[PDB]
Structure formats: C-alpha cells, structure tokens
Amino acid sequence: MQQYLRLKAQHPEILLFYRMGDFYELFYDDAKRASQLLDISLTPMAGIPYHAVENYLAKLVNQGESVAICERKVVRIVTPGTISDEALLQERQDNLLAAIWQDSKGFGYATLDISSGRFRLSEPADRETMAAELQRTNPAELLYAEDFAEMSLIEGRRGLRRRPLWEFEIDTARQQLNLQFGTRDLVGFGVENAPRGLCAAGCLLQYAKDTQRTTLPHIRSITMEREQDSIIMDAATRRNLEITQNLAGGAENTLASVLDCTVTPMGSRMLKRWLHMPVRDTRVLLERQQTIGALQDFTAGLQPVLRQVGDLERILARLALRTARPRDLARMRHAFQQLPELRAQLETVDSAPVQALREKMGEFAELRDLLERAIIDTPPVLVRDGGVIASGYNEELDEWRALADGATDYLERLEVRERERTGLDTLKVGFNAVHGYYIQISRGQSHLAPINYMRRQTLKNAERYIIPELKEYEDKVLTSKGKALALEKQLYEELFDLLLPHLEALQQSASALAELDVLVNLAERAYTLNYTCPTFIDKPGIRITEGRHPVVEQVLNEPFIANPLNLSPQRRMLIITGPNMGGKSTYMRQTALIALMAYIGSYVPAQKVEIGPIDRIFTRVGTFMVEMTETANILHNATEYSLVLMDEIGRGTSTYDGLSLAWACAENLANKIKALTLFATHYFELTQLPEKMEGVANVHLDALEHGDTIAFMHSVQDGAASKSYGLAVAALAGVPKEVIKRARQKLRELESIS
Amino acid sequence: SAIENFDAHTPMMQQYLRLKAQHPEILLFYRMGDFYELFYDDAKRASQLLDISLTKRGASAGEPIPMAGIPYHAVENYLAKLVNQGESVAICEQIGDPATSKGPVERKVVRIVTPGTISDEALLQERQDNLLAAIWQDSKGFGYATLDISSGRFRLSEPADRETMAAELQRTNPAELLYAEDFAEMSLIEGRRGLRRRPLWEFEIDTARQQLNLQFGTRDLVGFGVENAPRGLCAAGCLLQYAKDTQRTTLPHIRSITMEREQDSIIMDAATRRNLEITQNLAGGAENTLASVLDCTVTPMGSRMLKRWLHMPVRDTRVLLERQQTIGALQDFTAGLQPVLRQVGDLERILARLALRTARPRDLARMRHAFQQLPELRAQLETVDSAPVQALREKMGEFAELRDLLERAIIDTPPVLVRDGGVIASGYNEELDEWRALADGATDYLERLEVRERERTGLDTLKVGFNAVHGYYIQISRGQSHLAPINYMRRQTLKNAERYIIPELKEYEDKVLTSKGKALALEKQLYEELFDLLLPHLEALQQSASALAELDVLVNLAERAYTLNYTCPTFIDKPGIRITEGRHPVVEQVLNEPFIANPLNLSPQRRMLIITGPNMGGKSTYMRQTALIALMAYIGSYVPAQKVEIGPIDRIFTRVGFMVEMTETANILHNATEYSLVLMDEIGRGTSTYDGLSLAWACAENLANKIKALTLFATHYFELTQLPEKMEGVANVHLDALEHGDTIAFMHSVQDGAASKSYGLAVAALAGVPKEVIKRARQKLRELESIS
DNA sequence: AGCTGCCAGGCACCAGTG
DNA sequence: ACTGGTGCTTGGCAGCT
Ligand SMILES: Nc1ncnc2c1ncn2[C@@H]1O[C@H](COP(=O)(O)OP(=O)(O)O)[C@@H](O)[C@H]1O
Ligand SMILES: [Mg+2]
Ligand SMILES: [Mg+2]
C-alpha cells in the first residue's frame, strides 16, 4: 500500500479517508484518533460504510477535524468551519470560521458564517475581552498565526489551524478584501482604519476561498463590532446565566428554551445571536420594542406562513456555491409562494420597521413563476437520475420523453404479443444492465420457447432470451432517455444562471424573513407570557416591579413569587442575607436576565421595569481559588455602569479571612466602582455596612417552619435576616438531637461574642 | 383496527403471536429460513435501533404486517448493537424439519440475550466484570445477589440500610438489575442501566430454596453458609430463575453460592469509593485511578480479580498474612512468571463457554495453549519455598490428558466457527478422514476431466468449474459452443459462455456433496463430543483458572511493590494507624516532581486530628492517602510508605463538603464505631456566619467523645483548632506554608499543632484580587483579631 | 477492482386449472 | 384442492465490465 502512504504525505495534517470497496478506511495514527472520536473498531485500520460517510463526516467536523476524501486522488475535503451541506450542519446552530491574531498594539479577530455570508471583525482591547469574544462566537474552526503569544486563549479549542505569518499581511488583506467586495476602499463598511482586524479577516477569507476553490459571491460585506456597542459578558457569566446552554452542557431549561419559539431555523439562529449580544443603542431597542407591540395581533396568522419559508438562508448559500439540489430549489419556490400572503398580512401593521422588513422581503414573482414551470411538484434528492424538470417547460425534452415512452409502451405490447403467440403464461419482458432488455420464461416452460429466441442468461428457475426486435427498441429507449437526462441537466444548470443575478436581493429577503421570524416570536412570547415593555433612563439604575425569573417561572410547577428591585446611584448595593437555597441566586439571576432581555429589545417578565445603561454584567453566582479569580475579574473590570451579582464570597476559607475579604469587596464595589450590585452573603456582620456607608441597604429572604419541614420563602424584604436555619435543616436531616443541642449552645456563644 | 382474533390470523402469525406473547417487552428475533425477522412494533423498533429497512409482509386479511430482518449468519453483529444499548433480545429458532411439516415448523425460543447474561467474547469487555444482580427490600432491610454468568461466581448479601445498599450497588456495578415490583427506595435504583422490574412471586423464599438446592444438588444450603439468610435467598432465587430463563440449558459452572457478611470486609460508603478514585476517576474515566497504577496484571481474569480486591478489602488476618508472604516470596520471580502467565489468557471466560456448550474452536485452542503452560509454571514455582505459593501451584493442576486430547482433536489454528468444518484435525477419527478423502480428491479429478475433455474435443476454451446455484459444469465459450458434443447436456447459459453437464460429472457432484455433508455432520458430532470429555473436569478446571488469576494478581502486586518502593504493613490489636513516610500512591505517580512523604499517628488516645493549612496545602491528599494505605494493607498488598502499623478497621466513611451534607453526616454519626475511619473534608455549612461551624463543632465532638472513631477532620474553620484544649482524644496538625513577601509557598508536609495563621488573604492575593482590596481586608482582619 | 442483482429459506399470497 | 409463479429483510459474490 505504497499508494496510500505516498498520498497521505500530501495531507499529513488532516485525516484521510481512503476508499476501499464499500468503505473508507483510515490507517495508522489516523485509524487511532478516529476510533477514539467516532468509536468505531480498531483492527492498524478503521473503516466506515460508504452509505454512512456523510453521517461520520458531520461528527468529525463537529469535533474540529478536517477530513480529506480519497476516491485514486484526494477529490474532496471538508473543514469544520467551511461546510455548507445540510447533511453536515446543525439546523439551529451557527457554524463559524474564525481567525485570531495578536499585534503589539492588540488583538485582531474575525468570524465568518460561510452559509449566510455574515462576516465580522473586531479588535478586542485586551486578553479578557478576547476570551469573552472567543466564548461568545465559539468558532468551529480557528486560524491563528505562528507568532502567537497568548496561547492560553486558544490552547484547548477544537479546530485549531496554525498559519504562517505572511497570511496576516495588511496590504494583501486590503487588496483581497477590496477585490472580494468590489470596492476601492473599505470606508463604506466602516473598517478602513481597523488594520489589526483586517489582517485577521484577510487570512480568513483566503482560507475560505482555498477550501472552496470557488467564488463566494454571497460574501459581499463586512461589519465591525465595537466594545461600546454591546453589553459585555465573560465566559463564566455567559455560562452562569444559562442563555443557550445549561450548566450540565444541555440545551433544555435555558433562556433560549423559553424565548425561542421561532418557526424557521434561520430565525432561531438569529435570536440566539441576539441573546448572546445585547445592544446598547436604545435607538435599535426602541424599534425592536415598537415592532413587538405592533405585531401582537398578527402573530397567529403570520407564523404558519413564515414556517413554510424554511431556511432560505442556507439554501441561498448552496445556490451561491452552485451546489443546490432539487429540493433546495423546490423549497425556494415554496418560500416564494408565501411572499404575497406575508405581504398582505403586514400591509396593515402600523410600524415603520415592519413596513421596511416587508419591502426588504421582496416578491420575486418571476423567479417563482420560473420555478413553478421548470421543476416538478416534488423532485428527488439528486438531479443525477433526472426526473426534475417538469413537462411543458421545454419542447425538446417533452419530445425525447415522448419517444422513450413510445418505445417503452411498445416493449410492453411486445410482451403481450409474444404471450398470445407462445401461449406461455410466465413470459414477461424485463430489463437489466448486463443484458439490457430480455424475455423471461420459467424453467418449466422454457423448453417451449420459440426457435428464434436466443438464450443469454440462465437463472435457477428461468431462462432469459433476446431477439433483434427487442434489441431494436432497447436502442430507442436508451438513447432517448440518455438525451432527456442530458437535457434536464442542462436546463438545471440554466436555472442557476437565471437565479444568481438576484442573489443580493434574495439574501436581503432571507435576512428580512429571519428578522421577522425573531420579532414575530418575541411579540408572541411577550403577549403569551405576560411581559412588559421596559423603559430606558439616562443614568444607571434598575427599578423592577414584580419581576420574575423568565425560565424558573415556566418550569417549576409551584407558584413563582415575584419580587421588586430598586437600584439607583443612591441605592447601589443590596446586602442580601437569609437562606440561599436557590432563592437568593434566583433573585440575582433574574435581575441579570431582565437586564439582558431589556437590552435585546424584548419585553420582560415584570409589571414594570425602568433600566439605565449597562456596559457589562457580572455574575459570580452559584474552589475558593476559582471563586476568588472570578471576583478579581470583577473588581478589576467593573465600572459604575456595570451590573454585579455576587453570591456569598468568603465561603471556603476561615471565618475572619472570608469576612475580611467580603467586607473589602463590598466596600470597594460600593465606594470605588459604584457598580449596581447585589451582594449575597451569609455573614451577618456585613449587615452593619449600611450604617457605615451611603448607597448600601439590607434585604433578605426568610423561611417558614411548619408541620414536619421548612418552607424556604422566595420573597425579598427590607432589612437583615434575623434567623439562621442550618440547625433546623440538620434536625430535619436526622442529626441526633443531642448534637443539635450542643450546636445550638455553641452557636449562641459564637454569635454573642459579636 | 381489524379485529385480530386467533382464527383471523395465518398459521404463521398464530405461532408468532403465541411466542411473542411469552416475550411481550423484548425484541423477538424470529427464525424464518435464512433470516431472523421481527414484526409489528418489534420491526419498527429494530429498524431504528439497527438501522435496517422497515418493510412489510402482505396479508390476505387487510392490515399489512410491519416487517424487518437480518440474515442468520450476521446475527452476532446486530446483537452487539442491541445489548450495548441495554436491549434484551429473545432468539427463536426452527426446531423441526419443514420437509415433514404440514404447516409452520415448530419454533422455540432457545436463548434470551440480555446485558447481564452475555458470555460471548465479542459482547464483553476483557478487563471488566459484567454482573447480573437482583435486589429485594423489606420492612427490615435489603436482599442482594450477584452472579457472573461467565465465571459462575454467585454471591448473596443483606445490606443493613439504604446507604449500605447504595454502596453495594456502586461496588458491584451490575449491568442488569432485577428488582421486585414492590421496591420502595426507587432512588437507589432509578437511573441504573439494564433495570428489570419483576413480579413479586419471583422472590418467594420457598421457591428460592427449592431452586437453589436443585441447582446445587443439595438438600439444604447449610453447607454454603446461606441457609440463614432468607432475605438474600429471595434475591438469589429471582436471579437464578432469570439466568436459567435466559440460557435455557444447564448451568454446571454455577455450583455454589457464598454469603458476603459485613464483618468480613471493610465497608466503604459510596463517597469513599468515589473520593478515593479506586477504579474510576471523579470525571468518570479510568485514567489516574488506583487501578491505573496498581493494575499491571497480565491476564484479563487477573485484572478483574484485582479490581474486585481493591473494592472489597478483607478483614481476615490469616488471608492477609498469606497474601503478603506470597508477594514477598515471588518478588524475585516476577520477570520469569509474567510472560508465561500471560499466555494462559482468559481461561475463566472460556471455561464458562465450555460449561454453556458455546465454546468456539479458538476457545478450545486457547485452552490448549493454556494447558501447555502449566508445566513451565509448575517448574518455575517449585523452588519458591512458601506454603501459600505451593498451595497455588497445586491448585492450578496439570490436565495432561486434556492437553493431549485437544492436541489430537483440533488443528493448530482452527477457524472462528465450527459451522463450516475444518476444525477437527486428521487422524483423530478414521471415518471422518475417509469422508474428507472424496472432499480432497477435487484436486486431481476435476483438473483431469478438464484436460481429458479439452483434448478429446479440441475446444481450447473448455474449462471445468463449480457453481453453487447450478452445480459442477463444463464450460465452453460462446464461439466454440456450437461445436460441443451432442452428448453434453446444457445446464447454464451465460453472455459469452455455455455450461454443460455429463453423467460422469453429475455422478461426481452427487457424491462430492453427499460426502461433504457426511464430513461436516460427523465433524460436528466429534466437536460436541469434546464437550462431553471436557465437562467432567469443569470443577478442577475452574479451580485452576481461579488459582492462575490469583497468581497473576499476587505476582503483579509483588512487581509493583518492588518497582514503586512499597513496604509490608503489620497489623496491631487495637484501632490505630501509624505511618512513617507515607505517600499518595496515585498522586506521586501522576506528578512530575517530588511527592512529599508524611507521617501519621492515630490511636485510641490520639483518635481525632483537626487538620488545617491553606487551600491547596495538601489537606485532602493527606486524608486520601491515609484511606488508600489502609485499603491496600487490607487487600494483602504492600504499601506506599517506609513503615506502616495498622489496627482493625470496620468501615471507612467520607464526607466531602445542604440536606445532603447533613443527611450523610447524620448517617456517619449513626453508624460509625471505635473501629471506623472517618474522613470529614471541610464540612459545616449554614445560612449564617456560625451556623455551619457550630454543627461541625458539635459533630466533631460527638465523633471524639461518643463514637470515638479514628477521624481525620480537615477544616477551614480556625475556631476548630481550639478543640484539642477542650476535648480528650483530639489533636491539631497542619500542612505547613511559608510566606515570603507577596506569595505563599506550599510545603505539603504535616506538622503538629495548629498553623500560626490561616491564609485566606494570601490565597486570595494569589488569585489576583486587587491589592487595594487585600490591603483593606488585612485592615479589617486586624480589627477582628483584636476581639480576643 | 467497481456495480448490479441473484440467491439464501422460511411462509403467505394469487391467478389458473381441478 | 393443487401448480407454479410472486414478495421480503441483508450479506456474499457471480458475472460482467
Ligand atoms: N504531599 C504532597 N506532595 C506533593 N504534592 C502534593 C502533596 N499533597 C498535595 N499535593 C499537591 O497539591 C494539590 C492540592 O492538594 P489538596 O489535598 O487538594 O489541598 P487542600 O485539600 O488543602 O485544598 C494536589 O492536587 C497535589 O497536586
Ligand atoms: Mg412444510
Ligand atoms: Mg481539599
């Protein structure tokens, strides 16, 4: 097998699937890492059935592996960040290619969604921001330069691709980007003066082009994301708020699981982007809010229609790549068929933004008519075997098919003719590749076949024959079909030519449809779930009347207790005592979720919310070392525009050390940072803080002891807690009574020394 | 819905539905000629689970029957798929002869493949036990039994309480758990794999006794020491009935049952087992466990046995001394024994297939190879002047006659299956050889006919061949075919060739296949006969496998003791643990840098240590290594230290710190004794400042003053360092830290007394907390420190 | 060596003479 | 009632390129 080895060197950095019979087999080291990744056997060979290759490619690509397919020669390659095939993508998840690099002055970063064409670049100000952007974008494939210093940022990520330094040269990048966009300069994209970011994007685009060996006309724009444009959230915060991912790695019981009832896969993906990137510009937010409210009574009629539009976004990508398959065009046609009904439904909505989306939507009556005439109602997966072009679309095509059916109908008549004559009831005409057409007779009647029948194939219970008259029409059939097939294929390629001119307008439509899906959805959720429109004030503050945790309230089959919150420049930090038992943490997390939601443009779970600008949200909620590292992050980065949620810091070390640290953090947060803060603590001593500094107050939760248990109330009230419940809980758990009695005596002694 | 009364169904479905009625909840593979088929819901389910095509069988009565199936020769690959997903599958075979059957041939379920009853090499993992268990509860308590179908090891027990029961489940980790329908503590059981709810009557004591006595050939179970344990017998009865129901043959390798009494092993609670990382790390992997360090056995059966020992430390002083002695005596011989031991392989699992009568040709082959190693082992072992070793040598036996049999009866490298012959070697049976003669004449006869006929006809394309569908033939090209002898009878037409038969060739065919049939049948008789000659020796063979596995374990522990520098612990009469220069056996191997050895002094006068030191100071490691040294001493193995004296230990408890914390703690307080090793790691959590600490203080006090167990009590609460003053039996120790400016160095060495200070602030400075904050914390700290 | 499609052996089904 | 043809799963491989 010197053939495999000599071709493997052409692709040493990538897994190589080597076709052998009805399998692709991997050898040596590739056989290893693969068995470990797909959990297939190990014989050193490993293999997968031909009919399942796409399934296994999806898994490998999902785990960051590029794969080269040898059919001999490497005829196809898939990389985790550049796929567009529906079989390899996850319907409701974004799949991004990214590139990261470090200059002396700072970071450059860029991402690309190869299906939608969404191309973004940024220039994170420091390591912490960079880490938060990596987590937020979660790239499937990440290009980085050799000369990369901070390798801790990308070390454990899947899909790492180490690239030479010359791939990050600013002049090349500019030239390449300007050529891709068809512009002289980048001023119109607002990135002309963002060199570091441009370098990242240049390497990215070159890598994408290379993986496709194709033009990428759907990539026509790039956008710059700035720090002040969005509320910043770090990995731990993002993870702790359970936005699209729960703490156990799942997808259930998350903010998205409740907010995301969109009806198309592109709308679902767009909504998840918004949730992970709340905007600060209240201009955008106000528009989103207006829209939500104006779509309330339109929601029922809109969604079932929107649902049929489907994932026009990813189909458009295969159109741009010329890989679209018959059902892609079929689904595109179906989506076009919904446009007029959507147009009619939105006509009355009094909302300027809705009217904009409506126009942006388009109609494409011509394309619709074209696809209606060209393609049959329900085409096959592939064009390969023809049968996609409808009848009446092309005369030549209708003719060859008429000829094929005529020969076909003749052979069938031949079967009945030969049948009266011979008088053999088992006589039939069949078709096979090896022998073409033939006449079959059962073994038992075969001795009666006419003398002009030529034996060609003996079966266990039959004899197949041929005659010139059979071979005559076979020719008619085959040559006619061959031409029909060839013509369908040409007509099919011609469809791309007629569609591609309108690629730009179609991308805008899918984008508008996706946004309508998101907004129609948030409209439905607000109305259905009793949300309210938050208002914005100029200075930092959060006033919530009867707020609820938007996830907990839908899951728990027990009445959710709503709670107020009044935070302002004069009431900046609340010290929260009492049992936590999930109650404090819930109250804190819901505060962050409501802020989150306010800043995505959505309605929120409350009777009333007034909220000020927020630059970042900090949530150290839920090792003493990790807890201290996360605390350091907050004290170092938070500002007076930050929302900080602290959950009992001090646990995990000595009483005096933890109390000293918590007192110090709280004081710093209240007097230096001045961030809006919810400080949950178990230290009763911290409740004296409000008597020592302005802007701090005590609230608490309590519990109710009754019968043979304890009810941990979820109601936040003013003042310090006046009870602890550790001993009550220990008593309920069965700690012997005399132990509890001693504990009680010790507790009093410890507390009274205060 | 069509009304589907018996009479509305075809004879086929009537038979199928009656059999399926006997297996309503599991897939029924139904033998239909060359296929195993499934129907209705089984077919749809199979389609999804096996990824095969869901199709249908036509019906003259309306509703087409959902259908799916696989070729009989491929069944094993599909069973693997199913049993790996925890699916049971009943195997129905055709029992009678269609050729003398009016309607449907007799069919019967001959075996049910289930997750805890597999014995086939392809479905099992080499180094992991695969147990079937049965659990049963009462008002009083629990009954539990386990069976390893592929070794015959049959055990029973009666865990006193829930926490014990949970620890038992975790330790035995059954792959299939049979439970009684009236089971109350479902929390112990839901979430387990291969759960099997059983009707109450399968746990009836009278039937259990009757069935076990029958299986064992006894009148009572007095001799097994379980006549006394009806709670356990009920589970054992449910189990055995399951095992017999799944195998539907005799189980001669299940000749005994043993009771596991609490007093006979160190009982480790579930948390101890998880925290010690015996065979599974806290993340679920096998990397960096005690097992990954200690397990360098050379056979699979030895790997399994060693893991069983690690999980069940023995309290019997005598067994322990004998294991130590063996390890001592064999430490020189390891390099010589291991390569030889390795060639014995997994005799245990092969013996199970022998007993089940499922053993494949290469199983008998590997048995042979194992027998062949006995003499060398026996030789290597004669010199070792240690009784326990000599006792093992004897038990491994010789089986010279069986070695000869296998050497005479089967070829060097037999094929995987017996089904296509080629297994029994020549000279074993003279008739068999005679039948093969005609089967090995094919060499010359057919080549001779080809030449002869090619020459006679002058047709150069002429060839003689065989076709399974059409038989033997003479082939002439299409071009020369019109020139064939008029005497040649046409048999098979091809595109460019014509095949013919003649009387001489047909006569050859007739006999060359009648003979081939006789040769295969005779072979299978002789193969099944091998079982009858081997079976009578099963018990001694099982004793031998058991001895070889124990040897592998002891030889490995001796190698490890030498290689990793371990010493032989001694036992003392009263509870106590004295360690000189001890190390954590895993941490020291998985660390690229020196491990700091430490001592330990525990006694009835010094029975509780309050352990302080900075977070990351090595507090948790010190406790763990203690428990591990204890565990290792109590399996008979040498220990990671310079010297170790250790007293009796009944149980090891661990609490590694809400309702859970205090519930577990409560169980510790309720069940620990002066003989228990208690490890409390940072417990005591309340909703206020002193809430939690107060409970930890009262708990510590109870452990010291009422229970009096051996207790390691690691804490971050500095208040607790005051306990020794107040309480007899308590002493402070600490993991030393050195502060040199902005930083803190962890020395990882245990010192007597309390640390001079706690290091929360420095540890927090280390984590990056801003200096102005730390400075403010230090100021607050001095305020607090002035209260007293 | 790569595609197609017969065959395997159960049993029912169905159109065609009994 | 009989004859004699069809159908249906997947793995193996003949029979042709
Ligand atoms: N005695 C030892 N010798 C060398 N390293 C040690 C030793 N004990 C602990 N360590 C290292 O220090 C780390 C922290 O130990 P740990 O027992 O978890 O400390 P603690 O319980 O005080 O927080 C361990 O992961 C180990 O890597
Ligand atoms: Mg029959
Ligand atoms: Mg610890």
CSV table of N, CA, C and O and ligand atoms in Angstrom, one decimal, chain B residues 587 591 593-598 613-625 681-682 714 735 747-749, ligand 1:
chain,number,residue,atom,x,y,z
B,587,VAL,N,-1.1,10.1,43.3
B,587,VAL,CA,-0.6,11.4,43.2
B,587,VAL,C,0.9,11.4,42.9
B,587,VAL,O,1.4,12.2,42.0
B,591,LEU,N,2.5,12.9,39.0
B,591,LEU,CA,3.0,14.2,39.3
B,591,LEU,C,4.5,14.2,38.8
B,591,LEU,O,5.3,13.3,39.1
B,593,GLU,N,7.3,15.7,39.6
B,593,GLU,CA,8.1,16.4,40.7
B,593,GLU,C,7.9,15.6,42.0
B,593,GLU,O,7.0,14.8,42.1
B,594,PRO,N,8.8,15.9,42.9
B,594,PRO,CA,8.8,15.1,44.2
B,594,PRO,C,7.5,15.2,45.0
B,594,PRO,O,7.0,16.2,45.3
B,595,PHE,N,7.0,14.0,45.4
B,595,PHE,CA,5.9,14.0,46.4
B,595,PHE,C,6.5,14.0,47.8
B,595,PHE,O,7.4,13.3,48.1
B,596,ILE,N,5.8,14.8,48.6
B,596,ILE,CA,6.3,15.0,50.0
B,596,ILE,C,5.7,13.9,50.9
B,596,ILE,O,4.6,14.0,51.4
B,597,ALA,N,6.5,12.9,51.3
B,597,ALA,CA,6.1,11.9,52.2
B,597,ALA,C,5.8,12.5,53.6
B,597,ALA,O,6.3,13.5,54.0
B,598,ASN,N,4.8,11.9,54.3
B,598,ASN,CA,4.3,12.4,55.6
B,598,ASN,C,4.0,11.3,56.5
B,598,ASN,O,3.8,10.2,56.0
B,613,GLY,N,-4.5,24.3,57.3
B,613,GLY,CA,-3.5,24.6,56.3
B,613,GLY,C,-4.2,25.3,55.2
B,613,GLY,O,-5.4,25.2,55.1
B,614,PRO,N,-3.5,26.0,54.4
B,614,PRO,CA,-4.1,26.8,53.3
B,614,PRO,C,-4.8,25.9,52.2
B,614,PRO,O,-4.4,24.8,52.0
B,615,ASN,N,-5.8,26.5,51.6
B,615,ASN,CA,-6.4,25.9,50.4
B,615,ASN,C,-5.3,25.5,49.5
B,615,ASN,O,-4.4,26.3,49.2
B,616,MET,N,-5.3,24.3,49.0
B,616,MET,CA,-4.3,23.7,48.1
B,616,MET,C,-3.0,23.3,48.9
B,616,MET,O,-2.0,22.9,48.3
B,617,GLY,N,-3.1,23.4,50.2
B,617,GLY,CA,-2.0,23.0,51.1
B,617,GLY,C,-1.7,21.5,51.1
B,617,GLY,O,-0.6,21.1,51.5
B,618,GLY,N,-2.6,20.7,50.7
B,618,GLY,CA,-2.5,19.3,50.6
B,618,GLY,C,-3.3,18.5,51.7
B,618,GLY,O,-3.0,17.4,52.0
B,619,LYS,N,-4.3,19.2,52.2
B,619,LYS,CA,-5.2,18.6,53.3
B,619,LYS,C,-5.9,17.4,52.8
B,619,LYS,O,-5.9,16.4,53.5
B,620,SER,N,-6.6,17.5,51.6
B,620,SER,CA,-7.4,16.5,51.1
B,620,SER,C,-6.6,15.3,50.6
B,620,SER,O,-7.0,14.1,50.7
B,621,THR,N,-5.3,15.5,50.2
B,621,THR,CA,-4.5,14.5,49.7
B,621,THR,C,-4.0,13.6,50.9
B,621,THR,O,-3.9,12.4,50.8
B,622,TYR,N,-3.7,14.3,52.0
B,622,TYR,CA,-3.2,13.6,53.2
B,622,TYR,C,-4.2,12.6,53.7
B,622,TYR,O,-3.9,11.6,54.1
B,623,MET,N,-5.5,13.1,53.7
B,623,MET,CA,-6.6,12.2,54.2
B,623,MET,C,-6.7,11.0,53.2
B,623,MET,O,-6.8,9.9,53.7
B,624,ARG,N,-6.8,11.3,51.9
B,624,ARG,CA,-7.0,10.2,50.9
B,624,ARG,C,-5.9,9.2,51.0
B,624,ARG,O,-6.1,8.0,50.9
B,625,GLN,N,-4.6,9.6,51.1
B,625,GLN,CA,-3.5,8.7,51.1
B,625,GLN,C,-3.6,7.8,52.3
B,625,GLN,O,-3.2,6.6,52.3
B,681,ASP,N,-14.1,16.2,55.3
B,681,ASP,CA,-13.5,17.2,54.5
B,681,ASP,C,-14.3,18.5,54.4
B,681,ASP,O,-15.3,18.6,53.6
B,682,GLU,N,-13.9,19.5,55.1
B,682,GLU,CA,-14.5,20.8,55.1
B,682,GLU,C,-16.0,20.9,55.3
B,682,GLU,O,-16.7,21.5,54.5
B,714,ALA,N,-10.5,17.6,58.4
B,714,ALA,CA,-9.9,18.8,57.7
B,714,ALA,C,-10.9,19.9,57.7
B,714,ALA,O,-12.1,19.8,57.5
B,735,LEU,N,-0.9,21.5,57.5
B,735,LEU,CA,0.0,21.5,56.4
B,735,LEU,C,0.7,22.8,56.3
B,735,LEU,O,0.1,23.9,56.2
B,747,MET,N,4.3,23.8,51.4
B,747,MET,CA,5.4,22.8,51.7
B,747,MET,C,4.9,21.4,51.7
B,747,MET,O,5.7,20.5,51.6
B,748,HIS,N,3.6,21.2,51.8
B,748,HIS,CA,3.0,19.9,51.7
B,748,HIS,C,3.5,18.9,52.8
B,748,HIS,O,3.5,17.7,52.5
B,749,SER,N,3.9,19.4,53.9
B,749,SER,CA,4.4,18.5,55.0
B,749,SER,C,3.6,18.7,56.2
B,749,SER,O,3.4,19.8,56.7
E,1,LIG,N1,2.2,15.7,49.9
E,1,LIG,C1,2.2,16.1,48.6
E,1,LIG,N2,3.4,16.1,47.9
E,1,LIG,C2,3.4,16.8,46.7
E,1,LIG,N3,2.3,17.4,46.2
E,1,LIG,C3,1.1,17.4,46.9
E,1,LIG,C4,1.1,16.7,48.1
E,1,LIG,N4,-0.2,16.9,48.6
E,1,LIG,C5,-0.9,17.7,47.8
E,1,LIG,N5,-0.1,18.0,46.7
E,1,LIG,C6,-0.5,18.8,45.5
E,1,LIG,O1,-1.3,19.9,45.9
E,1,LIG,C7,-2.6,19.8,45.4
E,1,LIG,C8,-3.6,20.2,46.4
E,1,LIG,O2,-3.8,19.2,47.4
E,1,LIG,P1,-5.2,19.2,48.2
E,1,LIG,O3,-5.2,17.9,49.1
E,1,LIG,O4,-6.3,19.3,47.3
E,1,LIG,O5,-5.1,20.5,49.2
E,1,LIG,P2,-6.3,21.1,50.1
E,1,LIG,O6,-7.3,20.0,50.5
E,1,LIG,O7,-5.7,21.7,51.3
E,1,LIG,O8,-7.1,22.2,49.4
E,1,LIG,C9,-2.8,18.4,44.9
E,1,LIG,O9,-3.5,18.4,43.7
E,1,LIG,C10,-1.4,17.9,44.6
E,1,LIG,O10,-1.1,18.1,43.3
